[PDB]
């Protein structure tokens, strides 16, 4: 594939913007840059083939560019550690865009084709998770590490009977979530296709409960602890 | 607002494609960059290969038409002559 990786670039020049459009990359990473809303808008309006976008640590204002019918149907979105990206902003981001042009009939989320979503560090709650569950039927890989409002109940919602996430989720990352405990493992038993559960540095999660989950699931799927509190399929 | 600004008459010559409608009127508050962009729009050119000059010297982007008049055309009969290059 083709990736433009300008992570930590302290100066995104017009010449760089132009060069991005010339290449039409599959993936674009502008993490930890000062990309403006104006510049990102400019880009997404000319990158119809963009699939993976990484914006970790960018301003919410810049990120808000994606709240637009111009957003392509992204496969991957990373907005870890975006300051000011909370529940209200997740709603703008995930809900159907309200700048529809009179010659457009798409009234669903422009993130509905998301397969990988990275939200680590964000100050978000179950509200935002309900939106994800509503809008993202193909969600496979979800990163919620370092999120302080992520609880066992959160996992309950994502794995609930009725949801698309129950069966679509394969990989989930809950590293150093404080409010997650061993009982989230019983909810993960509900997941037909789960193959990767990262509970590293979860203080309330025990190697004990993990070793158990392996034996209870052993019947159908063979899981192991490549390392402690990191459950993988074999 | 801008509609009711004082207006300046300009004449634009190429410095060795060409502009047909070379007499221009605009607001005294219009800047070189603005004139350069509308010029480029009409001639179907990218604003990066086009420069505005006076007395064969490039004019700064942010200089207003009034500032050109005051600095280089003071009291002189209309229109104010400029040049453009590609």
């Amino acid at each position: 594939g083709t990736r433009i990786d300008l992570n930590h670039c302290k100066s995104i020049t017009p010449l760089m913007l132009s060069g991005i459009i010339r290449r039409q990359p599959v993936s674009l990473d502008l993490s930890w840059t000062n990309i403006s809303k104006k510049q990102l808008s400019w880009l997404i309006n000319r990158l119809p083939g963009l699939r993976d976008l990484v914006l970790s640590g960018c301003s919410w204002i810049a990120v808000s560019a994606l709240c637009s019918s111009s957003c392509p149907l992204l496969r991957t979105l990373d907005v870890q550690w975006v300051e000011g990206l909370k529940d209200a902003q997740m709603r703008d981001l995930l809900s159907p865009p309200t700048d529809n042009r009179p010659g457009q009939m798409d009234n669903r989320s422009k993130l509905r084709n998301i397969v990988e979503l990275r939200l680590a560090g964000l100050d978000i709650t179950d509200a935002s998770l309900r939106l994800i569950i509503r809008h993202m039927p193909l969600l496979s890989k979800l990163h919620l590490s370092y999120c302080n409002h992520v609880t066992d109940q959160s996992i309950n919602l994502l794995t609930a009977v009725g949801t698309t996430t129950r069966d679509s989720l394969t990989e989930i990352n809950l590293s150093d979530c404080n409010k997650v405990t061993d009982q989230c493992l019983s909810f993960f038993k509900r997941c037909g296709n789960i193959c990767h559960i990262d509970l590293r540095y979860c203080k309330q999660v025990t190697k004990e409960g993990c070793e158990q989950f392996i034996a209870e699931m052993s019947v159908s799927v063979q899981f192991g602890q490549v390392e402690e509190k990191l459950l993988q399929k074999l | 607002y801008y509609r009711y600004d004082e207006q300046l008459n300009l004449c634009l010559e190429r410095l060795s494609s060409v502009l047909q409608n070379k007499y221009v009127r605009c607001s005294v508050r219009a800047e070189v960059r603005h004139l350069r962009r509308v010029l480029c729009h009409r001639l179907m050119l990218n604003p990066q290969h086009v420069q505005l000059l006076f007395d064969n010297e490039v004019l700064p982007d942010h200089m207003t038409m009034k500032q050109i008049w005051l600095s280089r055309w003071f009291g002189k009969p209309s229109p104010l002559l400029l040049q453009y290059s590609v």
Binding site: - | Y2, R25, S78
Partner: protein, 118 residues
């Protein structure tokens, strides 16, 4: 073309030299406006006053004292050393006919009007 990290004008284009344009406040309510001289307009349109008023009724023609015209035009720095003023009398006892400067009149005079958005 591409914006940079930290980022309503009207241009008239003519093949012909443009008529002069005067910034005059006729009424306090309306405030300053741009105007052409009617006589210049008719010269360029090769047409009598009568025909012009009859066939272009939406064009605003406004008549004021020439003296008042002189007083206001001479207040402009743009007409400070103008041999254009010379053509008028500051102690005139006469009326003077203006035409409001609009897109309509620019079009009627055969110009093309370009707009700039950011």
């Amino acid at each position: 073309n591409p914006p940079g990290p930290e980022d309503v004008f009207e241009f008239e284009f003519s093949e012909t030299p443009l008529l002069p344009c005067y910034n005059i406040q006729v009424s306090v309510a309306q405030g300053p406006r741009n105007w052409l001289l009617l006589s210049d307009v008719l010269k360029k349109l090769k047409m009598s006053s009568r025909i012009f008023r009859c066939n272009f009724p939406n064009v605003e023609i406004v008549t004021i004292a020439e003296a008042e015209f002189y007083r206001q035009v001479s207040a402009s720095l743009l007409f400070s050393c103008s041999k254009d003023l010379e053509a008028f009398n500051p102690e005139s006892k006469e009326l003077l006919d203006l035409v409001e400067f609009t897109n309509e009149i620019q079009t009627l005079l055969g110009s093309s009007v370009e707009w700039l958005h950011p």
